[PDB]
Amino acid sequence: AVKVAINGFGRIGRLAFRRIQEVEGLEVVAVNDLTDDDMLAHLLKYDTMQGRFTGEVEVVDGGFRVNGKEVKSFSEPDASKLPWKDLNIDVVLECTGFYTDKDKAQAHIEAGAKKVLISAPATGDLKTIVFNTNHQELDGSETVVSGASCTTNSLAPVAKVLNDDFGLVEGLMTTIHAYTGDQNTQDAPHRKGDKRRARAAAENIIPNSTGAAKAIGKVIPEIDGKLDGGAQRVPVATGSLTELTVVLEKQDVTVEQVNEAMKNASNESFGYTEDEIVSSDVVGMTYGSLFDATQTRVMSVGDRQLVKVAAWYDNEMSYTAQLVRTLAYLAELS
Amino acid sequence: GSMAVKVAINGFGRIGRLAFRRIQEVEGLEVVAVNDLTDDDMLAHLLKYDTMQGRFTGEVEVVDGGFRVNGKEVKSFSEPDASKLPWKDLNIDVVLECTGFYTDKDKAQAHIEAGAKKVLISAPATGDLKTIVFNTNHQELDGSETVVSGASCTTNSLAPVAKVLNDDFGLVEGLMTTIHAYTGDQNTQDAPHRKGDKRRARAAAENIIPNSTGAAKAIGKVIPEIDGKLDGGAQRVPVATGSLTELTVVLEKQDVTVEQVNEAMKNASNESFGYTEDEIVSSDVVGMTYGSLFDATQTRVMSVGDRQLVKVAAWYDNEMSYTAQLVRTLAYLAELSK
Amino acid sequence: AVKVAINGFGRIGRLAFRRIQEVEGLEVVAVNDLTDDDMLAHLLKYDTMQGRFTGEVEVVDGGFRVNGKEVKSFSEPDASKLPWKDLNIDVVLECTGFYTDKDKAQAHIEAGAKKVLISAPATGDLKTIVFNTNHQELDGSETVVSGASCTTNSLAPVAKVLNDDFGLVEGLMTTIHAYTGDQNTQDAPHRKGDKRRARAAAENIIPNSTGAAKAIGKVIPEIDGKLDGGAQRVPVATGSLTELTVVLEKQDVTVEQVNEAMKNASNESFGYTEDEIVSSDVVGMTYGSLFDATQTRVMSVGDRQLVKVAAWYDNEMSYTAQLVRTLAYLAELS
Amino acid sequence: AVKVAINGFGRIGRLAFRRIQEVEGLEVVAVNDLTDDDMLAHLLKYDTMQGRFTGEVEVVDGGFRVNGKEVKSFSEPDASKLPWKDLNIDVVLECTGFYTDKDKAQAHIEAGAKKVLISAPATGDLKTIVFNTNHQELDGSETVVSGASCTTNSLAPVAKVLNDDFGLVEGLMTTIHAYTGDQNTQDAPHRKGDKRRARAAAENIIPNSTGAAKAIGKVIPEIDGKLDGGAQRVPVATGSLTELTVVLEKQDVTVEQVNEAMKNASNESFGYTEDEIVSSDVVGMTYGSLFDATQTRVMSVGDRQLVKVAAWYDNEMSYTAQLVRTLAYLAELSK
Ligand SMILES: NC(=O)c1ccc[n+]([C@@H]2O[C@H](COP(=O)([O-])OP(=O)(O)OC[C@H]3O[C@@H](n4cnc5c(N)ncnc54)[C@H](O)[C@@H]3O)[C@@H](O)[C@H]2O)c1
Ligand SMILES: NC(=O)c1ccc[n+]([C@@H]2O[C@H](COP(=O)([O-])OP(=O)(O)OC[C@H]3O[C@@H](n4cnc5c(N)ncnc54)[C@H](O)[C@@H]3O)[C@@H](O)[C@H]2O)c1
Ligand SMILES: NC(=O)c1ccc[n+]([C@@H]2O[C@H](COP(=O)([O-])OP(=O)(O)OC[C@H]3O[C@@H](n4cnc5c(N)ncnc54)[C@H](O)[C@@H]3O)[C@@H](O)[C@H]2O)c1
Ligand SMILES: NC(=O)c1ccc[n+]([C@@H]2O[C@H](COP(=O)([O-])OP(=O)(O)OC[C@H]3O[C@@H](n4cnc5c(N)ncnc54)[C@H](O)[C@@H]3O)[C@@H](O)[C@H]2O)c1
Predict the structure, then answer these.
(1) Does the keyword Nucleus apply (chain B)?
(2) Closest residue by Cα to residue C235 from D20, D179, D151, D94
(3) Are the beta carbons of B288 and B307 closer than 8 angstroms?
(4) Domain with A25 in it: what CATH number?
């Protein structure tokens, strides 16, 4: 099996560990964080939104044991000091949020890892990958790769269909997004100086920035610069919705045409539904994006149209499933 | 001679109780009677204590036939059929119709039959009546009306924004999403829904819930010159009050900037339409009395060549923002029939 | 198979349906509620806290079809008008909340049903059953039975151990309880005139009454009148905790003695844990009561002691699992 | 006026600032935190649970201006490096959560402050004060003082009445408590290694420890060791309840006797209600404890009784009001 180390055993890190248990060919041999083994094991076992871990978890000397298999744990904030060479790490899943740059993530390579896959958008000379939209741009020689964002994984397959089938002129996005760990529990100073993420997460509708639409060109180059938009963080603990409003080249477009085009492009990454679901219904789902045909709207005044669509995503498990698909493909290629 | 306008509140719910509270601070208007489907102890308690809007500042005491507020008697009734209420005997000038069950001109006429002079419905309503957003189209009321709609919370948030966009830039078309606080028409836990809505059927405080709204689709009732040019829906989310309306538009004027849009909105600001450049969140608008609060920090202009999309957002307290507007319209409607 | 009808396809009714799919010899052939079939099918498929239904549901002519088998649906507010005789109904699961009385529940017997099991405490000359505490009191001749309450199922096995091993003098209970459908979404008049259940359910700590401790004698006769207490409804959608503070006959009681006695009494209904869990960790669990050893306290001043214990329960699934156990047992005996 | 510096402009720090605007002869001249002035001014202006600050707040050179008064701001994590001598600080209101110990808080004294009042329980040789229960124990010479906890402030006036009027044998407590900033937004490693405070704050009933009952003897010495108990953190953003179950020496006790005793002891710190309120009703209240007569229970089996009572508190504003009362009193002494 391909030997995986997880750096940052947080929401994405732990869910990635869970997902990897189901993927033949990938094995987590080590985890790194900033805490004790009792804490690591406990948070793997128990998960507020994603439910209890299926297998058995036991704290042992040097880490924890999951279903018989030992996992080595470390508590090293400086990635360059990790014993990746000694453990023969093939790929690091970088999930801390503190190495979201090619040069920063290179620390893992210096430490002895063969490759790094970052669980977030990242700057620098690297490829940004949404599985089943642009993963074929990987050839296996890459040392550092980005798995994009939760929102980009929800948006990319939708934007691709709109452009391919109708011709995208321009568009604006709003994602109604579950609150995340970069937000405060109570009103308090925020480390990034963000006066909105400073506010009590579970008691507010909170406007905030996102790169998903603005930076869509890193995943779909042919629509580079044609999208922008933002986010509204709301009091659900996981589960999100991306709404997109577009101008198209094709004219006299119908709701039926848009839905059929989306249904035709469905796969394991891009789901299609006509059920009147709500955010809790997508918790734990493994589609990167779930197109909701019930929300499609077309505004027509004369020969001028606006087309609006919406797609659900579990910002946790939807993204994690996509990240692990990319991880496996990156591993297979090399 | 001159007297305070005698108001009766039908439906002592969220809007009804907040209207009562608001009227306490508006001179020339007095609530003499309330009607609901419960006991006086319950009515007094819910007036006194309010989860989101805070403790009532007056003194509330249950008495014979109703309750006393700061020494002033309010008559209470528990009659589901509006035509049976003693509006004649009580000399009722205007009924604030806040039950959600008389949202129709013919149905709301029951209050007029009962002896009230006028009815203002706290919601969109069917029939041949006028739909009024204060400080957008209230001057369309001539005084001959007997049944009027106070529009919706969302329409009150949307209308001043849509008017500025059209007046200054020319509205071609647009789409709206309101990120809206959950309301009493939603279930506490997943359960069958009275109106058959499979989404309002779901646990209100645990979900992002898509739902329809008339605000954009029916904007033409308030701003006739943009009839049919808007559409959109709602996303109900787990805040108990406080909402946001986002509007994405195509405009006639070219090379529009964020600065131009913000300045145009600021110039249109009044007691109904507020303006902010502060990075606020939903809890910051709870209890506010603007019908709509334009958030300049959320303005975006997408340009690709000569083609532009403009996006704006305005906050509203679906409860107090709408209530303040409703009371403004109430006062004006009574003023016309001196 | 035992032919089951569910009156009231609500939280307990639907979860009972789900659990029955896992029990050979138990079959739901009919459901009665006050809504359409599309609604019933949708709420079976999608569940905010309990997750997506495993199998597949299809709306048909008579009602709905689940995994091949058809389920008939009705809309009679008066249960005596239901065609239970024609459908040869063996047991009605009474889950509406409107027939919580022996004489009221008799409506189903008049309609043609052989037995009624009410999913709540009930007034009248009937047996109140907590599975694995007093289910042996059933002989199979009963026509109307109560499955008790969620809180009683959490409390009974704990109270029994305390009395058996230490001698119960007296106690007081508080359950920190998930909000339920008998509470309002927003501050509004309450149908029962309850000024506290009138308040916004998900925004408040709300004191309220319970019959679990006061009526414990219906399940454990030897401690009748020895307990009382109440509830505090809080903003979690499901998952609850029962705390019990008692005076005991035995002296010099220790935390270890209490925990060991509870562990020794553990079974499929009564769980034991030493893990530092929280409420979300018990969502979907099938124990009727999960004793939490980390919460045990003994206060000693001279020869006088107060003993405090706590047990978790999913007021939904914990109760439902117990109700179906009692159903299967009652159906087996005659 | 007594010159106050606030260390840690957080929930308690900011509410204390607001409360000090209500107290004559007490001025906040300086604030220290770990952020910039834009953020400090914003969080003073806008408050999710406690509402908008009514006055004018503007960012100026070297801090911010509130209602015509300049507040100097700093961003220094090491308290011994603060300019307290230069600013002539009379009392530091220590609200960071990182100086809850006599010897650690001495850093403020070394920096030039005359006194320190800690906004939490604290270790070391100091007094622990619940205003209107034991503030008379202060004489004005103390250099470092603890303002106790939110829970202790809710508990002490109740426990005192129960002992004075009925004779306290023993008791156990549970506080059903709003979630606070020491809890995580999502399930995540917890800085203090608490596996329960690690969990998503607003989605769980979370058992946790509290010292309020176990350490009541610091406030009421005559009942030292007679109480214990813990907390259940629940998804309300502020507003809490303390439930206390006791054995008393007085026999044949009634609900009426207990309720009357509590009402007789009511003052500006200890309120009394017979209304069927809920947690949101106490948000922003200034009583340290609100006794709820509707929740009083007496369980009798033979001559053996268990007595249960409950008191509400806004863990934020109730505690803050008490802290500022103690602050004013401490300042008034030795003037
Ligand atoms: N919905 C989501 O939560 C979501 C979705 C997609 C992507 N992401 C991205 O994934 C990353 C992690 O997000 P998360 O929500 O899991 O955050 P998290 O806080 O839950 O996880 C981060 C973990 O990394 C650990 N950590 C921090 N610094 C470290 C260091 N220097 N060395 C080792 N461990 C360290 C922390 O202890 C924590 O456990 C972020 O970049 C985020 O943008 C999050
Ligand atoms: N955000 C908002 O809550 C909001 C905003 C704008 C408009 N509205 C509209 O205002 C109306 C009331 O909404 P609400 O949120 O206050 O609902 P609510 O449920 O809180 O209030 C309705 C009240 O009317 C009472 N009632 C029902 N039928 C009655 C009858 N036949 N006779 C007398 N009383 C009766 C109920 O007991 C209840 O107290 C609705 O039409 C709604 O669409 C609501
Ligand atoms: N935690 C819990 O939800 C829980 C736990 C244990 C016991 N219970 C008990 O179970 C019962 C149901 O609880 P619930 O939470 O599922 O309530 P619910 O409101 O979710 O379900 C009740 C269902 O019964 C239907 N109904 C009402 N009147 C009817 C009638 N006359 N005829 C046919 N159907 C009717 C309603 O449409 C609704 O779908 C109650 O007695 C409750 O006390 C609930
Ligand atoms: N319910 C309550 O929130 C409550 C009630 C009673 C007592 N307390 C106590 O009050 C204290 C603060 O609680 P809070 O809820 O306001 O916490 P908080 O997180 O909201 O505020 C703490 C503030 O101190 C700042 N800070 C941290 N380290 C610092 C340093 N070294 N130098 C300067 N500033 C620093 C932080 O940036 C933050 O703004 C804690 O000891 C807590 O136990 C809290």
Answers:
(1) no
(2) D179
(3) no
(4) 3.40.50.720
Helices (H) and strands (E) in chain A, counts: 6, 17
Instruction: Return the residue in D47, D276, D280 with the most chain B beta carbons within 10 A, the one to mutate for interface testing.
Output: D280
Handedness of CA D260, D262, D265, D266 (dihedral sign): negative
The DSSP string of A208-226 is: EE-STTTTGGGT-GGGTTS
Classify the phi-psi angles of D276: left when phi > 0, otherwise alpha if psi is within -120 to 50, otherwise beta. Answer: beta
Pair B45, C195: CB distance under 8 Å: yes
Cα separation, D329 vs D335, whole angstroms? 11
Q: Are strands D26-32 and D69-74 parallel, antiparallel or unpaired?
A: parallel
- CA nearest to B151, candidates B336, B325, B309, B10: B325
φ, ψ (nearest 5 deg) of residue A19? -65, -40
Q: Which DSSP helix (H) or strand (E) runs through C257?
A: helix C255-264
| Cβ-based contacts under 8 A for chains B and C | 114
Residue with tokens 């107290």: D23
Per the CB < 8 A criterion, the answer to whether C190 and B42 are in contact is yes
Q: Do the Cβ atoms of A310 and A241 come closer than 8 Å?
A: yes
Question: What's the number of domains chain D is made of?
Answer: 2
- Collapse the DSSP code of C204 into the 3-class scheme (helix H, G, I; strand E, B; otherwise coil) and give the result: coil
Nearest atom, ligand 4, residue D178 CA = 1
State both tokens at A112: 């002895």
CA–CA–CA angle B252, B257, B263 (5° rounding):
100
Structure determined by = X-ray
In the DSSP assignment, the letter for residue A81 is G
Between β-strands D227-234 and D168-178, what pairing exists: parallel, antiparallel or unpaired?
parallel
The token pair at B338 is 């001196």
> Do C195 and C91 fall within a single domain?
no
Domain match, B99 and B183 both? no
Report which bound ligand comes closest to the CA of C36.
3
CATH number of the domain to which C182 belongs: 3.30.360.10
Contact A132, A288 (CB under 8 A): yes
How far apart, in whole angstroms, are the C-alpha atoms of residue C297 and residue C307?
Answer: 6
If 0-12 CB within 10 Å is exposed, 13-18 middle and 19+ buried, where does residue B277 land?
Answer: exposed
Q: Return the residue matching tokens 């060791």.
A: D225
For this entry, resolution in Å reads 1.7
Q: How far does Cα D316 stand from its chain's mean position?
A: 7
- DSSP type of residue A101: B
Strand ranges for chain B from DSSP E: 5-10, 29-35, 60-63, 66-69, 72-77, 94-97, 118-121, 130-131, 147-149, 171-181, 209-212, 230-237, 243-251, 273-276, 292-295, 300-304, 307-316
Q: Which pair of structure tokens corresponds to residue B308?
A: 């532009």
Contact assessment for residue D4 and residue D90, using Cβ atoms and an 8 Å cutoff: yes
CB-based contact B192 C235, cutoff 8 Å: no
| Rounded Cα gap, residues C225 and B288, in angstroms | 52
Are B288 and A149 in contact by the 8 Å Cβ rule? The answer is no
Q: Do A106 and A125 fall into the same domain?
A: yes
CB pairs under 8 A between A and C: 29
Distance CA A44, CA C275 (A): 13
Are the Cβ atoms of C280 and D204 closer than 8 angstroms? Answer: yes
Ligand 2 close to Cβ of residue B15 (< 6 A): yes
C238 is in which domain, residue-wise? 149-315
Residues C87 and C53 in one domain: yes
- Is C95 a known active-site residue? no
d(CA C142, CA A39): 51
Question: Please, what's the b/e burial string for D127-148 (b: 16 or more CB within 10 A of its CB; e: otherwise)?
Answer: bbbbbbbbbeebeeebebbbbb
Residues C39, C107 within the same domain = yes
Q: Is C302 left (phi over 0), alpha (psi -120 to 50) or beta?
A: left
